[PDB]
């Protein structure tokens, strides 16, 4: 194997996405969906814990570098069940569903490759094993805020108020917990360097949870402009 062994709260009126509907409209429209309460208790994390998923999550981060690369979703996060794994390269996004034998403290290891002049990332250090892969999606990579919901076998994603729909995925798997996927690097540059010294800039992310609440969405010509809940 390759695995390595390595709060504050807030509140704001964001976390609005097109209401799981792709219908065009130009007036106010009510909706009973899974939404984020406007002045709810958001948790401010420093990095890294396995967080519950519940019915949805609000995720946002202002991290300057390319340290936060994605997330892992699933139940036991073991080889016993299938899990979701989103990874963002500088050029691509990669979404796979397999039976990942995840590491206790997963991270996307960044290392120097002397024969290519380049830095590269290793999905080892994230999972020691990966079998029974049923789904693989590849396209361009994803303040950066996301909404994740897993309903009717589909995993739906909105990004950027008014979070536009990013993509939704016929995953068809149960998702109860998730963890943020960090990119760590290491280099042999001083005679005393330690191979265990994986490091990166300080990374922090906001996590909220979605609630089943009636909302009102104001459309003018395209994007949702205002919103309302009580």
């Amino acid at each position, epitope marked *: 194997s390759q695995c390595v062994n390595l709060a504050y709260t807030n509140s704001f009126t964001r976390g609005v996405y097109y209401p799981d509907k792709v219908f065009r409209s130009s007036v106010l429209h009510s909706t009973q969906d899974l939404f984020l309460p406007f002045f709810s208790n958001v948790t401010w994390f420093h990095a890294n814990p396995v967080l519950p998923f519940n019915d949805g999550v609000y995720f946002a981060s202002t991290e300057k570098s390319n340290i936060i690369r994605g997330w892992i979703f699933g139940t036991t996060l073991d080889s016993k069940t299938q899990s979701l794994l989103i990874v963002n390269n500088a050029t691509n996004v990669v979404i796979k569903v397999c039976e990942f034998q995840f590491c206790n403290d997963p991270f996307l290891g960044v*290392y*120097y*490759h*002397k*024969n290519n*002049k380049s830095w590269m990332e290793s999905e080892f250090r994230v999972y020691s094993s990966a079998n029974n892969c049923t789904f693989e999606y590849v396209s361009q990579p994803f303040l950066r805020e996301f909404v994740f919901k897993n309903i009717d076998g589909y995993f739906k994603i909105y990004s950027k108020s008014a979070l536009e729909p990013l993509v939704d995925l016929p995953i068809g798997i149960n998702i109860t917990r998730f963890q943020t996927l960090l990119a760590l690097h*290491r*280099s*042999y*540059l*001083t*005679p*005393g*360097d*330690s*191979s265990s010294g994986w490091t990166a800039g300080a990374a922090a992310y906001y996590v909220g949870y979605l609630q089943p609440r009636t909302f009102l969405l104001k459309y003018n010509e395209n994007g949702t402009i205002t919103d309302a809940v009580d």
Partner: antibody
Amino acid sequence: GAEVKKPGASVKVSCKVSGYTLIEISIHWVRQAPGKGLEWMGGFDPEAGETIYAQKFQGRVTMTEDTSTDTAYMEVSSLRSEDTAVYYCATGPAIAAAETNWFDLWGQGTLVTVSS
Amino acid sequence: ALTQPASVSGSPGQSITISCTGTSSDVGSYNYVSWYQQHPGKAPKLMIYDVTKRPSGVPDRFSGSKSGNTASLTISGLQAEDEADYYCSSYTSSSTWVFGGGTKLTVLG
């Protein structure tokens, strides 16, 4: 382990490097004849992206690497009695963008005796 | 080859310097001078790299400098354990490394 060799034969010394992998490290080889000083045989130049050999040894020394096992090899051929020495592997940086260059010896070397 | 004095001696507590005279092809054109310490029967130990920098663990009594084509290692407060062989090493404009002949260092007893 120590190697005894008749003149004109060849030897292949090994070096198992833990910690960082071989792909993210420059490997050098130095030797020291009994009672004499250190002699640099060859090593990986970060700016060149490949291994450079001392001109005294080009054509007769070959260094290779097994990224699977993380073992560095060096093979000396047509060896004469002047090749009796302790052979040291050494680890150095590989990133050419940094402006550090050096090699740190790895283990306690292997003795290679050539005698008829 | 780089040129070092064959031998150098000093009393405990004193300072000494070992010089490493190269050429424009190595010490004159690059800041890649290393210094190695070798006790009898043991593998050389890196003491200085990049002319002046010391690896973690090496005491601050060891210091390096460069002037023109000449690099120098200086040891302050000679200890009995400092008695060893010292080799300088320099990067060359042929992308190779070269060694000095070695300086035997005696802490006078």
